[PDB]
Amino acid sequence: DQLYSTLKSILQQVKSHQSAWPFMEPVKRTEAPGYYEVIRFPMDLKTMSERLKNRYYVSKKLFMADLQRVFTNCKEYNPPESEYYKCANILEKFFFSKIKEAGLID
Ligand SMILES: CN1CCC[C@@H](Nc2nc3cc[nH]c3c(=O)n2C)C1
């Protein structure tokens, strides 16, 4: 499917970005105790990859929602001057640029 091919490319490019390291896998309780009592809807790029392979992203408004949740979770949990917050904004920019290059639209 062409939609699948585009999203996989976009996601793979996001996963390769230098600023994607805080979001590759789910937050661990060891890394942030009590995280999962504040962030009701966790999301990460591994979870997104599996969701892509399982064919859950039948639309753009969907792939966007999951990836945006990653950023909003980080901005809600962390302060603006932490490296996690900084990484979210850098990666968000890159993401939106990649969305434009592909002309991905609803
Ligand atoms: C799998 N692990 C590897 C290590 C980094 C972790 N991601 C992460 N950790 C902390 C700690 C405080 N705030 C955050 C945060 O916002 N994030 C996204 C994911």
| CATH of residue 95 | 1.20.920.10
Taking residue 36's Cβ as centre, other Cβ atoms within 10 Å add up to 12
Helices and strands: H and E segment counts in the chain? 4, 0
Instruction: List the resolution, Å.
Output: 2.1
**95 CA from centroid of ligand 1 (Å):** 19
Instruction: Tell me how far apart the terminal alpha carbons of the chain are, to the nearest angstrom.
Output: 15
Domain housing 57: 1-106
Cα gap 36→21, rounded to integer Å: 20
| C-alpha 52 chain-centroid distance | 12
The total of structural domains in the chain comes to 1
Structure tokens belonging to residue 60: 């753009």
Taking residue 32's Cβ as centre, other Cβ atoms within 10 Å add up to 14
Alpha helices, DSSP H, located in 32-82:
45-53, 60-77
What b/e readout covers 51-81, taking b as 16+ CB neighbours within 10 angstroms?
A: bbeeeebeebeebbebbebbbebbeeebeee
Q: At what angle do helices 83-101 and 60-77 cross, to 10 degrees?
A: 160
Give ligand 1 pocket residues (Cβ under 6 A): 22-23, 25, 27-28, 31-32, 74, 77-78, 84
Residue at 87: amino acid letter: C
